[PDB]
Amino acid sequence: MEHLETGQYKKREKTLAYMTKILEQGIHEYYKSFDNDTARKMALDYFKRINDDKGMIYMVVVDKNGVVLFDPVNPKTVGQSGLDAQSVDGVYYVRGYLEAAKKGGGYTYYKMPKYDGGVPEKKFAYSHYDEVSQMVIAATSYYTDINTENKAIKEGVN
């Protein structure tokens, strides 16, 4: 059961890298046509709708310098440098996003609520620097949600 759960989390890490790629490909269709401010507004409007779906993933976006562009959980941080932002478990999560992106893509692990004012819970982020939009885009998932999605499989094994 422990090896199963670890496997399911590693699978989800891979899923988030793929989802980030296809989301990037989607937003590029209008980056190619509109000015940066307009195209960014469209992308972040889309990402708001993803997060509002309350499903598999939640997006977070920062610029190359760590300015927070999109994070509905922490709306006061939007438009600010996030370089000194710390999760409740002491992780500089925006530094994590940037370190991962500098490597070509990677993972940051920290605790955060699912919504502004909610109870924190463990999550992880896959981040990647999208050269077309010049954004560091993070697709994120919560371990509780992965467990929920895998509950029928767990019960079957049991």
Added chain:
Amino acid sequence: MEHLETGQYKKREKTLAYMTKILEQGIHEYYKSFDNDTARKMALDYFKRINDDKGMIYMVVVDKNGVVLFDPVNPKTVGQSGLDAQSVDGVYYVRGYLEAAKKGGGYTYYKMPKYDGGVPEKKFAYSHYDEVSQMVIAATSYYTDINTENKAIKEGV
């Protein structure tokens, strides 16, 4: 192992319904900001790029009347009615897409290659009618691919 495999396929079914929702929400940006013909072009160019990724999903699109709008595996069907199209295992796959969409979303099961002229493999499609684009959008996955992705889990067990 059997119940594990079945559970992994059922999970992927739900994943496809979710992915189809977020893809719809994405192409809605095209339809809000570009004329109809340009928005459709953008959507199908996007879907070409997803299929070219050769990852988790491959898209197929038909209109509400069953005219094939997008299917790189079967390029000669694009622009034609697909109501009498059959997979090699005898499934009217476009009829399946439309029946599922009429119910609010659902699943069609059939064999198809991964690319034009390739070996046919078992797959399934989740289809849904997107009211903004007026397209029946199908997100699809191949069982070989689901098995590949779950291989490390299987070996751990």
